[PDB]
Enzyme design. Structure first.
Site, PDB file in Angstrom:
ATOM      1  N   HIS A 100     -15.606  -9.504  -7.716  1.00  0.00           N
ATOM      2  CA  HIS A 100     -15.320  -8.598  -8.827  1.00  0.00           C
ATOM      3  C   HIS A 100     -16.333  -8.736  -9.959  1.00  0.00           C
ATOM      4  CE1 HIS A 100     -11.511  -9.230  -6.643  1.00  0.00           C
ATOM      5  NE2 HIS A 100     -11.288  -7.959  -6.921  1.00  0.00           N
ATOM      6  N   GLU A 103       0.821  -1.208   0.000  1.00  0.00           N
ATOM      7  CA  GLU A 103       0.000   0.000   0.000  1.00  0.00           C
ATOM      8  C   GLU A 103       0.857   1.261   0.000  1.00  0.00           C
ATOM      9  OE1 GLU A 103      -3.257  -0.083  -0.414  1.00  0.00           O
ATOM     10  OE2 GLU A 103      -3.713  -2.178   0.032  1.00  0.00           O
TER      11      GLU A 103
END
Ligand SMILES: *[C@@H]1O[C@H](CO)[C@@H](O)[C@H](O)[C@H]1NC(C)=O
Ligand SMILES: *[C@@H]1O[C@H](CO)[C@@H](O)[C@H](O)[C@H]1NC(C)=O
Ligand SMILES: *[C@@H]1O[C@H](CO)[C@@H](O)[C@H](O)[C@H]1NC(C)=O
Ligand SMILES: *[C@@H]1O[C@H](CO)[C@@H](O)[C@H](O)[C@H]1NC(C)=O
Ligand SMILES: *[C@@H]1O[C@H](CO)[C@@H](O)[C@H](O)[C@H]1NC(C)=O
Ligand SMILES: *[C@@H]1O[C@H](CO)[C@@H](O)[C@H](O)[C@H]1NC(C)=O
Lengths: 50, 596, 99
Positions: B487, B357
């Site tokens: 998704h 991240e």
């Protein structure tokens, strides 16, 4: 003021102590063009536009 | 005066007002994520509706400037991005129906609760109730029950919804001058107008097949080894000649194989490289984890985190009283505001996630000089790939020894490298045929190659042919087995993981060649190398201003996605798997030989 | 969000040195007349800043004071504070009294 309507103050007939500003720790930029900060407290000018 | 100057002034006005509106919307989303309260939900919905209405009004203003009278490539790229209708070309009734279908699929996936018939007094949700069962259980019929019951409930709810979804999305895409919705998704990689570096929507499928044909022997050997180990774990269910049973792959859908590392370990007797206890003994806070990650990013030459990052990020779980989303997310809020929302524990996984991240944050910071509508990755693969390369580099034993987390007298022999590479293959290589099969099936569904009455007969045929996974019992057309995944049920592209996986090892080879590493690729660490960071930042600073082919030329020196760095990364493991598969049979049979 | 600070985003020509433009007339980027209404190709030239305390250092507000020093043929009256050495008497010293 806003940058489109920037305030202009004319400074005349007084004593300008520039070392108070230069030795302050509160300023991030003190970039002088055309003159050095050390001789500002010596030289004399007709008017100052702030 | 001219059309180009008019478009430039309009783009300046758009950039300036969109950056502040995007900030307000992103801050509302942040305040929802760090504080789950109903007024924050209302503020988020109001900001999102204002943002979407502003994008509609700016696209409406943008279409009045014709594209062919503009010669500057960046201005034409921003005007091309803005002038897309999206769902606006569709009628208001069908647009409302599509939005309602998407929202109700979101509610069905998020609030889907399934438990055993005749014991209905309490039930388990998908996260974390079913995830832990799928990842840790060793019982055949329990995993079979959970898998079949969740695909029964979710598929029988979602099948008419998905049948409406495919028709509405195909109608919107052909209203937007695309062949199908698959062509709309493949248009992200379309480069037009650049001499030599042009990329077509039809070239993407050919390149994916060409790379997967080289993927296939390594995946066949890995599948044979996993089949032999699961035959050892489950004695009678798995056949030597057939595919793997679907509910035994360690996850709910087969997305990753990383939960089978305990069952399929080569050398259990040898130790692991687990550094968790070492951080617990030295009392490493999550702040220390992020500071060590920042030390890694300043060692390669990238900029360090802002003061506003350390002031405004939430790097620890707040408590019982305050609710927050536990998923780690890097936020580019706009205007130089970069934050990380992660509930960081003292584990290796959270440390690698912190590096991933913060790599996202570095990527977001790099294109901050770009105009607002060009502030993205060159494609969807690069944005995840630049985090995955940090996940690769941080996981190395050299990095752990360098930061003091590993003992300096730890013996790095070939067996630990083999089992580490097998874990990385179960995480990384195993998702590639599932991703390719899912995207090829969705492309054939959108293209109309597969009729609605024949969706599942082809799908399991594809899974046996590509993934090498057999259905436990046959499924009819009342099931909707693809849409149980996050998704696909929520309208997300899935080829980004395939492109991310190949770009990951391409970037890894490029930075290790820049860093002059002289050993194996998986033994390579990109710390202390200023030139590798400079070569990375040359691509990172571009953002979406340049084509992804030109960016890939800037990094690796190639004009196309390549499969050879992945095979070079796993080559010791590939030779070891070829040695271990002498007695066993590599490859699978598409017949019903194990179980049906 | 502090929207009390404005900046001019569009003007037909660049400013002269030490010029102030406080006009609020609609900028005409296109051939069509604006007619005083903000429509298509016609934008209001003054746009508000959106200062927030959680902003990055490249977007945080900075107060700027520019001092302009000019010498004109008139007698210069803004002088610096000339430092004064303590007075010493009964010794042969170099004296400088008011020039
Ligand atoms: C979260 O929301 C509650 C509800 O009003 C509020 O009392 C609290 O101060 C908020 N916390 C943060 C960190 O915003
Ligand atoms: C395109 O426009 C940008 C700013 O909008 C400018 O910096 C760039 O130089 C232009 N490119 C060309 C080739 O004129
Ligand atoms: C968007 O839709 C309008 C009207 O349906 C159409 O005139 C325009 O060409 C469309 N734009 C694109 C890029 O398809
Ligand atoms: C980032 O690095 C610069 C120079 O190395 C340093 O002055 C600055 O304090 C650092 N930022 C933070 C948040 O520590
Ligand atoms: C590791 O190296 C030793 C000595 O070269 C060899 O005997 C052993 O088979 C190797 N193991 C693997 C998994 O390559
Ligand atoms: C990278 O640089 C840091 C900073 O001095 C140092 O502590 C570290 O040991 C270096 N890495 C290696 C592998 O020497």
């Amino acid at each position: 003021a806003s940058v489109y309507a920037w305030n202009r103050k004319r400074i005349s007939n007084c004593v300008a102590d520039y070392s108070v500003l230069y030795n302050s720790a509160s300023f991030s930029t003190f970039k002088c063009y055309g003159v050095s900060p050390t001789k500002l407290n010596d030289l004399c000018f007709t008017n100052v536009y702030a | 005066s001219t059309i180009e100057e008019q478009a430039k002034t309009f783009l300046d006005k758009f950039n300036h007002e969109a950056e502040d509106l995007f900030y307000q919307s992103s801050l509302a989303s942040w305040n929802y994520n760090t504080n789950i309260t109903e007024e924050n939900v209302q503020n988020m919905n109001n900001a999102g509706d204002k943002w979407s209405a502003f994008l509609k009004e700016q696209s409406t203003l943008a279409q009045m400037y014709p594209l062919q009278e503009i010669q500057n490539l960046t201005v034409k790229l921003q005007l091309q991005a803005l002038q897309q209708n999206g769902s606006s070309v569709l009628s208001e009734d069908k647009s409302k129906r599509l939005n309602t279908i998407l929202n109700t699929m979101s509610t069905i996936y998020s609030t889907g609760k399934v438990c055993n018939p005749d014991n209905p007094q309490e039930c388990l949700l998908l996260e974390p109730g079913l995830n832990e069962i799928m990842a840790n259980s060793l019982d055949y019929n329990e995993r079979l029950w959970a898998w079949e019951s969740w695909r029964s409930e979710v598929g029988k709810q979602l099948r008419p919804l998905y049948e409406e979804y495919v028709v509405l999305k195909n109608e919107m895409a052909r209203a937007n001058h695309y062949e199908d919705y698959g062509d709309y998704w493949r248009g992200d990689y379309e480069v037009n107008g650049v001499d030599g570096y042009d990329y077509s929507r039809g070239q993407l499928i050919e390149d994916v097949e060409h790379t997967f044909e080289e993927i296939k022997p390594l995946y066949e050997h890995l599948h044979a080894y996993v089949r032999a180990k699961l035959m050892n774990a489950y004695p009678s269910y798995i056949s030597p000649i057939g595919c793997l049973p679907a509910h035994l792959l360690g996850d709910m859908w087969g997305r990753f194989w990383t939960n089978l590392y305990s069952l399929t370990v080569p050398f259990g007797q040898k130790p692991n490289i687990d550094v968790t206890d070492a951080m617990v003994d030295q009392a490493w806070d999550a702040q220390r984890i992020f500071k060590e990650a920042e030390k890694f990013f300043v060692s390669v030459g990238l900029p360090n985190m802002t003061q506003g990052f350390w002031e405004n990020s939430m790097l620890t779980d707040p408590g019982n009283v305050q609710k927050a989303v536990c998923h780690p997310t890097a936020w580019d809020l706009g205007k130089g505001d970069f934050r990380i929302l992660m509930c960081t524990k003292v584990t290796m996984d959270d440390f690698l996630t912190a590096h991933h991240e913060m790599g996202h944050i570095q990527y977001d910071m790099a294109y901050a000089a770009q105009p607002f509508l060009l502030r993205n990755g060159a494609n969807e693969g690069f944005h995840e790939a630049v985090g995955e390369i940090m996940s690769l580099s941080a996981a190395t034993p050299k990095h752990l020894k360098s930061i003091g987390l590993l003992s300096p007298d730890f013996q790095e022999d070939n067996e630990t490298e083999i089992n580490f590479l097998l874990k990385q293959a179960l995480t990384i290589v195993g998702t590639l045929p599932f991703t390719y099969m899912l995207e090829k099936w969705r492309w054939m569904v959108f293209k109309g190659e597969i009729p609605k009455d024949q969706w599942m007969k082809k799908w399991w045929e594809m899974k046996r042919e590509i993934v090498g996974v057999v259905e436990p019992v046959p499924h009819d057309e009342t099931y909707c087995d693809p849409a149980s995944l996050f998704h696909v049920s929520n309208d997300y592209s899935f080829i980004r993981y395939y492109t991310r996986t190949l770009y990951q090892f391409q970037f890894q080879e490029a930075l290790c060649q820049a860093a002059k590493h002289e050993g194996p690729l998986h033994k390579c660490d990109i710390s202390n190398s200023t030139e590798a960071g400079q070569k990375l930042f040359n691509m990172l600073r571009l953002g979406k201003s340049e084509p992804w082919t030109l960016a890939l030329e800037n990094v690796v020196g190639a004009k196309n996605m390549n499969v050879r760095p992945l095979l070079n990364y796993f080559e010791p493991l590939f030779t070891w798997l070829k040695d271990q598969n002498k007695n066993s049979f590599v490859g699978w049979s598409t017949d019903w030989s194990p179980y049906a | 969000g502090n929207y009390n600070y404005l900046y001019r985003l569009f003007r037909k020509s660049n400013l002269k040195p030490f010029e102030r433009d406080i006009s609020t007339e609609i900028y005409q980027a296109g051939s069509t007349p604006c007619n005083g209404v903000e429509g298509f190709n016609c934008y209001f030239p003054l746009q508000s800043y959106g200062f927030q305390p959680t902003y990055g250092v490249g977007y945080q507000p900075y107060r700027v004071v520019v001092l302009s020093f000019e010498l004109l043929h008139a007698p210069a009256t803004v002088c610096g504070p000339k430092k004064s050495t303590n007075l010493v008497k009964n010794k042969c010293v170099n004296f400088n009294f008011n020039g």
